[PDB]
Amino acid sequence: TYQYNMNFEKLGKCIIINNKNFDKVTGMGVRNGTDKDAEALFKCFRSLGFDVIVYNDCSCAKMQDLLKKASEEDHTNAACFACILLSHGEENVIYGKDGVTPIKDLTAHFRGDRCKTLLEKPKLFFIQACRGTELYKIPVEADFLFAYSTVPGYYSWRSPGRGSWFVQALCSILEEHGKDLEIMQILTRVNDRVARHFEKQIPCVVSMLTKELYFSQ
């Protein structure tokens, strides 16, 4: 009664947006290491049970349409939904290959009223991108969980040969405890593992979940 009901045919859809190469008119550089991240993320989430698909170098129109179409699909037999963003980022926005687009516009499509088949089900968003200085009734905003690579305003570090710190940590924890720990315990251990690397960066978790989340039983 205190856990989300996972007794469903599918665990859910998991979209992974992998933006590595950006157009020159944006001014952003190549993201070496993100390929190693996405692959690591693909294996982990597939092990959990997600039906995962990976889209490379997406534009702002693509990302928006990609998640709009996803909120229009039938999730009646799905236990939940998950999206992972791996791109460049500024104050409250995410980058495409042709510019910027708001994160809150990508998630809005999954609001309780905008996506009925996902009501009372968890919508997870994991974002790996930067942020800084730019030059019988139920709520519609409930059951969302965001896991940012960094707090609002600071940088997120990435290694060309090893990949990003947040992703490396996230996959390590999921590989071993993905089936026996609650979602907040996993993300809390990620916070710690990322913190213990410079001794700066520290992930942020925003939870509007109403029950505990486990990926099994």
Asked if residue 146 binds other proteins (CB under 8 A), the reply is no
Task: Give the range of 86-94, 109-117, 168-176, 180-188 binding other proteins by CB under 8 A.
Answer: 86-94
Beta bridge partners of 193: none
Considering beta carbons, is residue 16 or 174 the nearer one to a copy of itself?
A: 174
Which one, of 94, 96, 95, lies nearest residue 104 by Cα? Answer: 94
**Under 8 Å between Cβ of 52 and 42:** yes
Would residue 88 show up in a list of annotated catalytic residues for this protein?
Answer: yes
Residues that bind a copy of itself (CB under 8 A): 2, 112-113, 116, 119, 136-142, 151, 153-154, 184-185, 187-189, 191-192, 195-196, 199-212
The single residue among 52, 93, 124, 130 that binds other proteins, judged by CB under 8 A, is 130
Task: Give the range of 85-93, 101-109, 173-181, 203-211 binding other proteins by CB under 8 A.
Answer: 85-93
Considering beta carbons, is residue 19 or 71 the nearer one to other proteins?
A: 19
Q: Other CB atoms closer than 10 Å to residue 69's CB: what's the count?
A: 11
Two structure tokens written together for 207 = 């939870």
What region does 207 belong to: left with phi over 0, alpha with psi -120 to 50, or beta?
beta
Environment class of 104 (CB within 10 Å of its CB; exposed 0-12, middle 13-18, buried 19+) = exposed
The one-character DSSP state at 29 is P
Distance CA 196, CA 186 (A): 16
Distance CA 187, CA 183 (A): 6
31: partner contacted, choices other proteins, a copy of itself, none (Cβ within 5-8 A by kind) = other proteins
Q: How far is the CB of 25 from a copy of itself (least distance, A)?
A: 31
- Residues 160-189 within binding reach of other proteins (CB under 8 A): 160, 164
Instruction: Give the active site residue among 75, 88, 115, 171.
Output: 88
Q: How far is the CB of 127 from a copy of itself (least distance, A)?
A: 14
Instruction: Give the active site residue among 60, 80, 83, 130.
Output: 130
Cα-Cα-Cα-Cα dihedral of 64, 69, 71, 76, to 10°?
A: -160
Residues annotated as catalytic (active site), given as ranges? 88, 130
Applying CB under 8 A, the residues found at the interface with other proteins are 29, 31-33, 87-89, 128-130, 149, 155-160, 164
